[PDB]
């Protein structure tokens, strides 16, 4: 049937770095959210502007699914009005955000003996991201008055760094896969109408 293509997002084998988060637009389908809000496999299930229990009785024009990987202690920054290198330089939610933030521990898949460094984040930026803005630039960060001329050096930093996901690490320094659902309702007819 016309089931919403969730699971292509949640159960995906590869997840994006936070600085380069993936967005999927979803429409013209029915969605059983109960697979989500009835699952004990999620560490964080926080919805802003809506209660997940009422989602299966609602109808939206479009649903946007954002997904990435960060550390445990950073999941608190995936929320309206938060501060941090993640909330400010990588992924920012608006003040009027309606949607849900779901996360789970992924140490089993996203860490390796010796450390997995394939997951990257943005450490420096000249200005905070606007809500839902994305920045996949690799322009050298100028921390001083000397122009960098595109070359790394003194007070000329590469803006990206990688995480170090070791299997034995503490829970807060372990990888967590995050999925953010955004709900937009227009005057056009609602096509994401899960029962």
């Amino acid at each position: 049937t016309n089931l919403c293509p969730f699971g292509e997002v949640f159960n995906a084998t590869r997840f994006a770095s936070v600085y380069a988060w993936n967005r999927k637009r979803i429409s013209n389908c029915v969605a059983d959210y109960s697979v989500l809000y009835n699952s004990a496999s999620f560490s964080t299930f926080k919805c802003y502007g809506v209660s997940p229990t009422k989602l299966n009785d609602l109808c939206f024009t479009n649903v946007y699914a954002d997904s990435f990987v960060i550390r445990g202690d950073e999941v608190r920054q995936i929320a309206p009005g938060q501060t941090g290198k993640i909330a400010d330089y990588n992924y920012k939610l608006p003040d009027d955000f309606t949607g849900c933030v779901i996360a789970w521990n992924s140490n089993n898949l996203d860490s390796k003996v010796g450390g997995n460094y394939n997951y990257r984040y943005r450490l420096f930026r000249k200005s905070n991201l606007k809500p839902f803005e994305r920045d996949i630039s690799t322009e050298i960060y100028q921390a001083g008055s000397k122009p960098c001329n595109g070359v790394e050096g003194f007070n000329c930093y590469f803006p990206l760094q990688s995480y170090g996901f070791q299997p034995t690490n503490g829970v807060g320094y372990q990888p967590y896969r995050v999925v953010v659902l955004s709900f937009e309702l227009l005057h056009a007819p609602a096509t994401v109408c899960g029962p």
Partner: antibody
Amino acid sequence: QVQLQESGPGLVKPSETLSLTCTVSSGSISGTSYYWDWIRQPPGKGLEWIGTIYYSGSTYYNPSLKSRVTISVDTSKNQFSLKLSPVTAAGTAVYYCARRTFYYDRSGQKVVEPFDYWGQGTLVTVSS
Amino acid sequence: EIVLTQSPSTLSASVGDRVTITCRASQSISSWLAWYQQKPGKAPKLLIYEASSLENGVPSRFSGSGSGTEFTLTISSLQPDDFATYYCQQYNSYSLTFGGGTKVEIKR
């Protein structure tokens, strides 16, 4: 980050109105998942919550101070305000405004976090 | 209605010592307890949420434990910058209430 700033007259005569206003910058008072609060600290003593407001105008007040408290909000100036109508000697305090964020449970219940953001605090003396 | 009682009222210790403040509740508040530090003249700063979880930026020498009606905040190695007065607060109920505070002085 968002900034909170308390403003108001620092001196009030007893049995008159204490009035303070909190201006929000680098952020919206109209955020859907925020609660906006007033707290006070009498000098040398502890902290006491007064009331909370939502951008729509809904209020919840401390039962001890209900008789004298009115909290309003004006989304167009990004401000919310406090009014203590018959102020007493207990009104002498440093007054703070603060923000909390709230979300809904997997169970559907509401969860409101503690106070993340505070103003600088303004002292108000109750005196003749 | 819910009363949070803090112990000790005052605490003086040397640098590097372990110190521990106690927050006792008149009723069960589950894990909905926060801890703030207030250095004099300034606003309270959130240190711990949900009794054991640490807010971003707070140094790791700060820890909290507890559930039900008894809670603790523990500083593993007291540092000179930790002279603040510390407060516990329950966000479990509609009427938010604070502790009486514990003043922490450094001995030298």
